[PDB]
Amino acid sequence: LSSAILSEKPNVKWEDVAGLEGAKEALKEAVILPVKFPHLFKGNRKPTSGILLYGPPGTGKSYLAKAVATEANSTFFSVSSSDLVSKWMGESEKLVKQLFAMARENKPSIIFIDQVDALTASRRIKTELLVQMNGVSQGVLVLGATNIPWQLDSAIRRRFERRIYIPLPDLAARTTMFEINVGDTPSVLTKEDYRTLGAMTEGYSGSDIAVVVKDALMQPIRKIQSATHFKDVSTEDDETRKLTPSSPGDDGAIEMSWTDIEADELKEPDLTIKDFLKAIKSTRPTVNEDDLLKQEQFTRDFGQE
Numbered sequence: 001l002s003s004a005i006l007s008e009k010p011n012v013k014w015e016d017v018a019g020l021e022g023a024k025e026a027l028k029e030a031v032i033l034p035v036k037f038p039h040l041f042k043g044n045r046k047p048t049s050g051i052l053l054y055g056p057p058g059t060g061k062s063y064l065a066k067a068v069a070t071e072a073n074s075t076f077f078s079v080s081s082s083d084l085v086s087k088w089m090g091e092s093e094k095l096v097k098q099l100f101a102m103a104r105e106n107k108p109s110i111i112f113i114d115q116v117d118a119l120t121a122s123r124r125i126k127t128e129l130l131v132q133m134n135g136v137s138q139g140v141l142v143l144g145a146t147n148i149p150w151q152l153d154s155a156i157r158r159r160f161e162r163r164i165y166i167p168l169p170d171l172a173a174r175t176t177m178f179e180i181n182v183g184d185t186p187s188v189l190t191k192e193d194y195r196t197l198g199a200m201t202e203g204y205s206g207s208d209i210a211v212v213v214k215d216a217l218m219q220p221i222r223k224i225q226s227a228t229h230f231k232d233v234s235t236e237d238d239e240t241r242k243l244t245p246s247s248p249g250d251d252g253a254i255e256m257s258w259t260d261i262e263a264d265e266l267k268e269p270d271l272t273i274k275d276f277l278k279a280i281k282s283t284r285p286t287v288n289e290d291d292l293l294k295q296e297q298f299t300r301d302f303g304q305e
């Protein structure tokens, strides 16, 4: 049990994952199939250990990998390549030998090395990986992720036979992400509305939409933080009272600072279309058609397979 190497029994199913209807498939057949039907792989037909997940930042690849882990009962074992070179460059060769050791002795397991491009002295940490990987049988497979395919070592890449591409969320994908992110939170938003925020957020990534909603969710909390007068909006059927901030002097006004209001009696105001627009506009897309063309090029070349 280390402090830098995450370990756990991931509980994320394909359905908890944005869209990626296809990368999911590829992963199913690349990882699930071989673990489920171990026999189909007799002499010379070896499953492929070492899967590379590459795509624009904010597409949440690690989530998807945990998803693989789950979908094929296996213990997850993450580790941020960034940190392995920054906040931990000292115990580098170690934690690596540790990460693999730990995983190797918890079969079935998935070793998730995020930001693999980060590993490029450091030429001393590239080998420990090679020594491990090109030495990992059928017990533990390595999933590596990167947002920068190109700036990836020519050697390490080669030890990543299969290579799925994780794209930015399409419309259906984004619309869901909004819905997922929001959740049970009281909103006035129709299903169609979400479809719209979906369209309004073209070019956005999972991470971006995340921020968008996380800020939109802060509207009502702000709406009562700056609330002066309230209103008793409870139907003759409600048990406890429902006091929700109201405008100036509406057909129900009544000056009161949220400070003086019962727990059971507070009624959070429903999310508004405006609420998301404000939040949408407040945020700009992280990627760009430039730092997104190299992806395609990569998916085109990606020779040393």
Ligand SMILES: Nc1ncnc2c1ncn2[C@@H]1O[C@H](COP(=O)(O)OP(=O)(O)O)[C@@H](O)[C@H]1O
Pocket (backbone or CB within 6 Å): 016, 017, 018, 019, 056, 057, 058, 059, 060, 061, 062, 063, 114, 115, 145, 146, 147, 177, 180, 205, 206, 207, 210
């Ligand atoms: N479908 C999704 N559901 C929840 N969060 C998501 C989803 N898609 C992307 N994310 C976001 O992705 C972020 C992680 O992106 P990340 O996995 O670090 O990219 P990478 O794998 O290349 O490092 C998380 O903080 C999460 O909020």
